[PDB]
Write a protein that binds this ligand. Structure first.
Ligand SMILES: COc1cccc2c1C(=O)c1c(O)c3c(c(O)c1C2=O)C[C@@](O)(C(=O)CO)C[C@@H]3O[C@H]1C[C@H](N)[C@H](O)[C@H](C)O1
Ligand SMILES: [Zn+2]
Length: 1287
């Protein structure tokens, strides 16, 4: 077990556990430091770390040491014995807390036992040299006032107090002659600068910190975790694996890019969590190999070490046994040490992926920042770590007795204020970028708030190198994971070999490199007239010396005037917010504007389903003007067009290497070796794909996802400024009143704040979901495809390479050069589907990915929509769309294909989309309007089949075609095998619901079936089991092709494709979504229009029509005439019959030209009687429950109702609509609905029943029933003349 020692600063020096040490960087000169051995090989020096610093640097200046830390200064820390002792007692408490759990004890045990090798690169393989500054440190044995006598000792860790910046903890290693033993397998004395009172503060993004912007927000760190984070560095340094490699460097070419030090993989491994995924698998292996090579040199030394000149006392055997166990080397019967691959593997992973800040936090139930790449807030001072009421060895701050265990309450700044103090800002220093405009006017932005964008150079191009494939060659994958459970239960990790005595010969060679630090400007001034995220966020603030402000939608006035603040909320919200009222109305106004704030913020949940976008936060553009000037125009629209890319401040230049060639080595006459090779080249091929994916993930995380992070924070800040501004205004208006009035004003400022804060949290959640959605979108559509492209090119190049190989050895393969010839094709046929979870196990990142893949709309690989008189693909995959001259396009997304050759659309699909799922799994949806057959051309109509959409590549693919009243879907696999499914509508109906009328089509394909849906309902099915591979990513041609009549045309709308089979539910939903409109429709399915002649149709009496009765002002109902010719294939009822009606608008006299009819509009229903325009009327005073409508010339009579409100009571899609007569617009008094009534007529001559055009109250209740009665006599449809229908 581990034993923590105990002592007080004032305890006497005994030259054993309390000594006068001579620190490595002292170079054998200068005074000594009283040091205490807290545990074996570990020392604590309770004093400021001054090595490499200037005495003045300890004071706060206009400089800074690190560009990414809100630095705290206080040169008095540790300036008295009592302060030192407190430092000591605190370190002791922390070490005890660390060992309070297995995982911590083991980390400590590994460190104590991980003694530095005796020597470094300069030392001969046969020697042990303790006389170097990385192995031995001295202690002054003689009395005070003279360095006369000194003894050398071995040591693993020396922990000092903090350097200039107290909250800037760092673990330091020893360099000698430009080299580091702690980076080359040896390990070396580690040093640390640590401060336990002043800890970091972090605030979880997707999470709330007490859920309230008005209270302190965030969480403070458990110093024990901060210490264990440093200890992990020590561990790495002690085992000599703290190696360097290709780092993550930030791009600093643009002014909005965050500037900072290069981040080594060793750092990200130490943090754990998602950070390791920012290190490409390529670089993971580079490091792996470097460490393994270091261990080989050390293991070779153990087989050659013979003596130790520096210290005649060193027992050669004892150390050989210690290092053998330290490095987990395998000995052998003779004493020959060698490396065991399994054991090495386990040790390496334990050190780089087991002991991580992330794993230790989860284990000690301590909260920490979600990622290394997270904004850094101001640090706080812990009041008293030595007070068990605030901090305990067992639980830290999260004490269950104080009910501070759940949700890390003890670390919550808004909840555990009795545990910490805020810091005096006048002691903090941060690196800022002073953004100035060319005039002058400047805004300060903390470097921390900028976008961190990894530069291209941060990534390895090892994928572009060639590789030799031999019967040997095997695949190599490094797991950035490690089961902490086995690590904690591991029985051999922790050594049980004697720890050598720490006493040895004094160090005489003080040669060592000592770092030199120095501050740099805390402010860097740049020039830019750009008004991006920083300026926009600024426009939303106001000086502390101003209390009277007014909101404005004008960004420019907001910057110009200090009393004007910018707001991205609605114009109505801004006017109300600036409204000044009487004290007697203040309360009302407060509730009103606060309620508005919530509604405005709540718009973050806006849907845009018609555009195949479930979530959109319309105001993000106005809020930050981030990326491609998203503050101009309509964001939603600009988003539907370019998508997530428009939100990025910068489009990274990705590194996507041309995968190196495979040099295959052949073995003549060997049936086994030659084969083994091929198989290995196959598996190695997979390592290439995976490695390419990891390369992408790493770039996505450090160049893209970081930008979206900055945007999420930007919105949290923007929404916050808005709440505070409203807070300011309210405070100001209230305080204008007298105390007498305030007493009678009913306001609860805590309720106002509670509601404002709630609306914000609700918005933050939407924004987070939205933004994470975008980020994953960019990964899958803008990054994965560019990689798939290369990998596919590599495959082909490898395909021939392998065949040509199975070719040259066709001899030494005899009757098998074939069995594998295919093996190569069938293998390079199936590709590896991307899976983010393979490159990371971070829960948040996985949920983002799964959430994305569960949204059916992300399966759209083509979506042709209209934009600026043209069709473009808005799927996000960038298909090229060529629309030729013979195609007609309207802004209602309708496109017409005619008989002319130039009436076609060429679509070149994206070749890099995993479409070939290996069984055929995709859907196609679209609306179509197919004209009626010409009566004089029925024969050709039912006989000639013609293609309309063709997608073929290598005589394989799919096709949509038409033959008369039948639409057909056809599949053709690579073998030329064909399967079809079709939907044919009847052409002998009095009234067809399809002929020349818009309707929704949906075709789905899965391994077994090809199904066709019409208007959401399944119509046909075809077993497609035999069909083999079908190539569907070929070019798509929209064009009427076949033996068609010159007049033959076709209308289509919303053509889209999904790389998956849609369910009956997804389809029914798409039908409803695409059917929706504010306006009503006409019989054909087009928008109902004002001032357009229409014949009237009645869904409750199909074959009936209205006619003005000869002798009376009523409309009789006659039977529609039918198809007179003699064909046996056709039958219908005339539609161009009866009166010709025309809908007139009731309000705003903007003339009588045209316009769309919208639900609930008030109209006049007129019609033409010869050369005059008449109107439909209702006698106001009828007592019966229905009467004949009154048709007569246009006139104003107080005895007749002439105003109609066009309605839509059906909740499901329909082209029918209803006509309601109301007393007047305002009145809720309903007269009745227009329909048809049968009356009995008995005259001196004729006795019969006759139907008339009527109004009736009966329908009022009928239209409320569910499901909606489509047969009701009050359901009408308007039919206008249409080239698609001739009778
Ligand atoms: C126990 O039934 C009733 C009791 C009291 C009042 C009522 C009714 C009633 O059944 C009823 C109706 O069925 C209808 C109407 C109605 O007003 C009432 C009552 O007031 C109105 C209607 O005739 C229209 O002209 C619509 O524009 C439609 C409908 O008539 C049906 C039957 C008619 N004879 C005719 O066949 C018509 C075409 O359909
Ligand atoms: Zn670190």
């Amino acid at each position: 077990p581990v034993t923590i020692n105990n002592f007080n600063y004032n305890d006497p020096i005994d030259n054993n556990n309390i000594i006068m040490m001579e620190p490595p960087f002292a170079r054998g000169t200068g005074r000594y430091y009283k040091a205490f051995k807290i545990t074996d090989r570990i020392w604590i020096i309770p004093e400021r770390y001054t090595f490499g610093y200037k005495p003045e640097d300890f004071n706060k200046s206009s400089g800074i040491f690190n560009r990414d830390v809100c630095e705290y200064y206080d040169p008095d820390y540790l300036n008295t014995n009592d302060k030192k002792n407190i430092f000591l007692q605190t370190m002791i408490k922390l070490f005890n807390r660390i060992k309070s759990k297995p995982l911590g004890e083991k980390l400590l045990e590994m460190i104590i036992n991980g003694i530095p090798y005796l020597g470094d690169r300069r030392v001969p393989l046969e020697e042990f040299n303790t006389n170097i500054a990385s192995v031995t440190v001295n202690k002054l044995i003689s009395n005070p006032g003279e360095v006369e006598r000194k003894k050398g000792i071995f040591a693993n860790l020396i922990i000092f107090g903090p350097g200039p910046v107290l909250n800037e903890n760092e673990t330091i290693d020893i360099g000698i002659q430009n080299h580091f033993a702690s980076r080359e397998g040896f390990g070396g004395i580690m040093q640390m600068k640590f401060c336990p009172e002043y800890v970091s503060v972090f605030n979880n993004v997707q999470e709330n910190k007490g859920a309230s912007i008005f209270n302190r927000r965030g969480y403070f760190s458990d110093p024990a975790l901060i210490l264990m984070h440093e200890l992990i560095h020590v561990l790495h340094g002690l085992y000599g694996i703290k190696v360097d490699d290709l780092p993550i460097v930030p791009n600093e070419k643009k002014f909005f890019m965050q500037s900072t030090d290069a981040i080594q993989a060793e750092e990200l491994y130490t943090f754990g969590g998602q950070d390791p995924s920012i290190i490409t698998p390529s670089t993971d292996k580079s490091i792996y190999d470097k460490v393994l090579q270091n261990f080989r040199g050390i293991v070779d030394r153990l087989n050659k070490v013979l003596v130790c000149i520096s210290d005649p006392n060193i027992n050669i055997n004892i150390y050989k046994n210690k290092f053998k166990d330290k490095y987990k080397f395998v000995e052998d019967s003779e004493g020959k040490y060698s490396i065991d691959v399994e054991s090495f593997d386990k040790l390496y992973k334990s050190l780089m992926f087991g002991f991580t800040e992330t794993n230790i936090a989860e284990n000690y139930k301590i909260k920490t920042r979600a990622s290394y790449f997270s904004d850094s807030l101001p640090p706080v001072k812990i009041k008293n770590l030595l007070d068990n009421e605030i901090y305990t060895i067992e639980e830290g701050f999260n004490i269950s007795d104080k009910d501070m265990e759940k949700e890390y309450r003890g670390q919550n700044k808004a909840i555990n204020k009795q545990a910490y103090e805020e810091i005096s800002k006048e002691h903090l220093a941060v690196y800022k970028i002073q953004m100035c405009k060319s005039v002058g006017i400047c805004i300060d932005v903390d470097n921390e708030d900028l976008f961190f964008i990894a530069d291209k150079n941060s990534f390895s191009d090892d994928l572009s190198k060639n590789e030799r494939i031999e019967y040997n060659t095997q695949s190599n994958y490094i797991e950035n994971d490690f089961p902490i459970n086995e690590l904690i239960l591991d029985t051999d990790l922790i050594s049980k070999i004697e720890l050598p005595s720490e006493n040895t010969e004094s160090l005489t060679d003080f040669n060592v490199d000592v770092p030199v630090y120095e501050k740099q400007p805390a402010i860097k001034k740049i020039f830019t007239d750009e008004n991006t995220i920083f300026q926009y966020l600024y426009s939303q603030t106001f000086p502390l010396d101003i209390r009277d402000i007014s909101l404005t939608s004008s960004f420019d006035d907001a910057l110009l005037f200090s009393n004007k603040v910018y707001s991205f909320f609605s114009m109505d919200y801004i006017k109300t917010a600036n409204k000044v009222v009487e004290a007697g109305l203040f309360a009302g106004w407060v509730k009103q504007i606060v309620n508005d704030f919530v509604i405005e913020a709540n718009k973050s949940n806006t849907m845009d389903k018609i555009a195949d976008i479930s979530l959109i936060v319309p105001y993000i553009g106005l809020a930050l003007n981030v990326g491609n000037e998203t503050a101009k125009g309509n964001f939603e629209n600009a988003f539907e067009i370019a998508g997530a890319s428009i939100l990025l401040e910068f489009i990274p230049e990705l590194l996507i290497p041309v995968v190196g060639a495979f040099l295959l080595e052949s073995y003549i006459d060997n049936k086994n070796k030659i084969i083994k090779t091929i198989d290995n080249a196959l598996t190695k091929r997979n390592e290439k794909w995976s490695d390419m994916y990891g390369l992408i993930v790493a770039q996505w995380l450090s160049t893209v996802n970081t930008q979206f992070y900055t945007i999420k924070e930007g919105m949290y800040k923007a929404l916050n400024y808005q709440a505070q501004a409203l807070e300011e205004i309210i405070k100001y208006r209230y305080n204008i009143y007298s105390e007498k009035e305030k007493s009678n004003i009913n306001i609860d400022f805590n309720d106002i704040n509670s509601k404002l804060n709630e609306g914000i949290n609700q918005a933050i959640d939407n924004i987070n979901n939205f933004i994470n959605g975008c980020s994953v979108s960019y990964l899958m559509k803008k990054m994965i495809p560019l990689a798939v492209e290369k990998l596919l090119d590599f495959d082909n190049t490898l395909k021939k390479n392998l065949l040509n190989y199975i070719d040259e050895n066709k001899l030494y393969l005899i009757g098998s050069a074939e069995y594998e010839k295919s093996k190569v094709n069938k293998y390079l046929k199936t590709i590896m589907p991307f899976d983010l979870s393979i490159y990371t196990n971070d829960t948040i990142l996985i949920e983002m990915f799964n959430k994305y893949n569960s949204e059916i709309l992300n399966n759209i690989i083509l979506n042709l929509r209209y934009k600026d008189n043209n069709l473009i693909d808005l799927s996000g995959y960038g298909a090229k769309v060529e629309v030729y001259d013979g195609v007609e396009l309207n802004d209602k997304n309708q496109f017409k294909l005619t008989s002319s050759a130039n009436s076609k659309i060429r679509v070149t699909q994206n070749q890099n989309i995993i479409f070939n799922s290996v069984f055929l799994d995709f859907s196609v949806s679209f609306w179509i309007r197919i004209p009626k057959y010409k009566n004089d051309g029925i024969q050709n109509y039912i006989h000639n089949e013609y293609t309309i959409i063709n997608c073929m590549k290598n005589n394989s693919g799919w096709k949509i075609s038409i033959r008369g009243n039948r639409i057909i879907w056809t599949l053709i696999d690579i073998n030329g095998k064909t399967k079809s499914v079709f939907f044919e509508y009847n052409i002998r109906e009095d009234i067809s619901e399809y002929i020349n009328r818009w309707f929704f089509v949906t075709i789905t394909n899965n391994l077994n079936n090809a199904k066709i849906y019409i208007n959401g309902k399944l119509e046909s099915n075809t077993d497609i089991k035999d069909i083999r591979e079908v190539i569907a990513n070929g070019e798509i041609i929209f064009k009427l092709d076949g033996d068609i009549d010159r007049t033959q045309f076709i209308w289509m709308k919303y053509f889209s494709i999904f790389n998956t089979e849609l369910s009956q539910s997804n389809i029914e939903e798409r039908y409803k979504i695409q059917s929706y409109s504010e306006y009503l429709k006409d019989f054909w399915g087009n928008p109902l229009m004002y001032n357009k002649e229409y014949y009237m149709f009645n869904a409750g009496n199909k074959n009936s029509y209205i006619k003005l009765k000869k002798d009376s002002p009523v409309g009789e109902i006659l039977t529609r005439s039918k198809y007179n010719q003699n064909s046996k294939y056709i039958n219908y009822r005339d539609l161009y019959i009866g009166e010709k009606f025309i809908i007139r608008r009731k309000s705003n006299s903007q003339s009588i030209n045209d316009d769309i009819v919208r639900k609930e509009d008030y109209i006049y229903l007129d019609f033409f009687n010869l050369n005059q325009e008449w109107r439909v009327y209702t006698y106001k005073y009828f007592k019966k429950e229905e009467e004949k409508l009154f048709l007569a010339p246009i006139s104003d009579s107080d005895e007749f109702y002439n105003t109609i409100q066009i309605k839509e009571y059906d909740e499901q899609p329909t082209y029918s609509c209803q006509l309601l007569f109301k007393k007047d617009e305002e009145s809720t008094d309903e007269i009745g609905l227009i329909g048809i009534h049968r009356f009995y007529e008995s005259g001196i001559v004729f006795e019969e029943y006759k139907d008339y055009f009527c109004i009736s109250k009966w329908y009022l209740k009928e239209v409320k029933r569910k499901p909606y009665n489509l047969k009701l006599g009050c359901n009408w449809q308007f039919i206008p003349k249409d080239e698609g229908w001739t009778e």
